[PDB]
Amino acid sequence: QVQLQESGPGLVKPSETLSLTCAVSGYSISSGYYWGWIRQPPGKGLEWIGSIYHSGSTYYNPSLKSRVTISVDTSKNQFSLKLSSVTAADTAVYYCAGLTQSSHNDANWGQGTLVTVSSASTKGPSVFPLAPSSKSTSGGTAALGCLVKDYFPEPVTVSWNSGALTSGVHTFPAVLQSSGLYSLSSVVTVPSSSLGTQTYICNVNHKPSNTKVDKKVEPKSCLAMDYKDHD
Amino acid sequence: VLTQPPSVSAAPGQKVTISCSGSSSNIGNNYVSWYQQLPGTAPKLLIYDNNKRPSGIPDRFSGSKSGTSATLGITGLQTGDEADYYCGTWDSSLNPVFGGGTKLTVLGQPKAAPSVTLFPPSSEELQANKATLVCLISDFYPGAVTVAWKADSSPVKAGVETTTPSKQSNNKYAASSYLSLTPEQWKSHRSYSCQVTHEGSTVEKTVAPTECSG
């Protein structure tokens, strides 16, 4: 099927030029009737940014003061948005979208990409395991997790057992600390019995910086290895 | 340019409608589409071509068009329908235009107490001369709590960062609070507590540097 997916740096310095691309798959891009960009600032509605048509004609939102450029690259099968001289008013989730035919308005939409306009520098996170314990044991289940600390900007992605674990998995919304860096935690609920005989690792990806890392998250043993420990 | 009510609410099981009004130059002349947007998610196409549903959209949703206005109908209202809804069409200049959005609230949801999980600082963090207590708060309704930390029996205000509660899938909310300490402070007290107050009732969790469960 037709799929759109945005790419861009999640951080742009004020006055610099924001550059995003939209990768089209399951479709030859030059076939499309319409490709466009829509954005949504936090807690607000949807704003049209600009458009390009099959004919190559481009139209842009007048409120965007000649700052917008949209082009199609057929060799890479993607289209782009360039928005110059950005301010904090341009912080938003940006969506690519398209209509394959003039006769229908069933638009295809990307997933959206968060763009933060800030002078602050990119910072990869520090990851720490959150070991399961008797206190984090309720029923036959055990909570363990990962603390993803002090990063910028949003977002971070966290996966458990490389996607193979999804049930009971809760990755919490991040806090913005007074330092201006984010932290979040991802917890997975598992069976208590599996704790000794299962490997649990959280995979943390901060796309904006080049941070990939995974912590082992395992029970703390409370028996010394160099003394008899069993009856 | 397209206007819809900023908010609508109704009890579960009921039928609800949301309309957007425009001009004969926009809605009057064009197909209208409708979008659903759940927290932290891209708008999802519900209705296109005035009344068609994309595959996978349930027949509880319907679209109609009366003159220069359009209407989204939702039957068998579920808590999972809570979301922002937007109409979209072409304006008189043939460019995209969206309604302002309608926030749909499902009334009469039962109160739900927060589940609280508190983690002590990891050994690795302590080794890096740092210490964070992590208080994770989930599955409450309504989505408002206040969080208080204690060192032994005394309130701690400093080094506390707490999130505004945000909506999750089950429309149960989640929140977290992080207390920053020196490894010495952590290792000097009998314990630390995270106290979560929701609708008059308090749920409390405690961690101690003496703990070793195995």
Author numbering:
A (entry chain H): 1 to 231
B (entry chain L): 3 to 216
Publication excerpt:
The results showed that the asymmetric unit of the crystal contained one Fab molecule and four domains (VL, CL, VH and CH1) with the canonical β-sandwich immuno­globulin fold. As calculated by the PISA program, the interface area between the heavy and light chains in A17λ is 1785 Å2 and there are 18 hydrogen bonds, one salt bridge and one disulfide bond. Alignment of the Cα atoms of the two structures using the LSQKAB algorithm resulted in r.m.s.d. estimates of 1.1 Å for the heavy chains and 4.1 Å for the light chains. Such a large structural deviation between κ and λ chains mainly appears to be owing to the J segment, especially to the Gly-L110 insertion in the λ variant, which changes the orientation of the CL domain relative to VL so that it forms a rotation angle of 29° with the latter. The elbow angle of the FabA17λ molecule is 126°. This value is at the lower limit of the range previously recorded in Fab molecules (125–225°) and differs considerably from that characteristic of λ chain-type Fabs, which tend to adopt large elbow angles. The major difference is that the upper part of the A17λ active centre is shifted away from the light chain. This shifting of the L-CDR3 loop, which is mainly caused by the strong interaction between Tyr-H53 and Leu-L96, leads to the displacement of Trp-L92 by about 4 Å, its flipping and rotation. In the presence of co-crystallized MES, Tyr-H34 in A17λ is not directed towards Tyr-L37 but turns to form a hydrogen bond with Ser-H51.
Recently, the novel ‘reactibody’ approach has been developed, which is based on the chemical selection of bio­catalysts from a human semisynthetic Ab variable-fragment library followed by eukaryotic expression in a full-length Ab. This approach has been used to produce a novel organophosphate-metabolizing biocatalyst named the A17 reactibody. The previously designed organophos­phate-metabolizing reactibody A17 has been re-engineered by replacing its constant κ light chain by the λ chain (A17λ), and the X-ray structure of A17λ has been determined at 1.95 Å resolution. In this study, we present data on the effect of a κ→λ light-chain switch on the structure and function of the A17 reactibody.
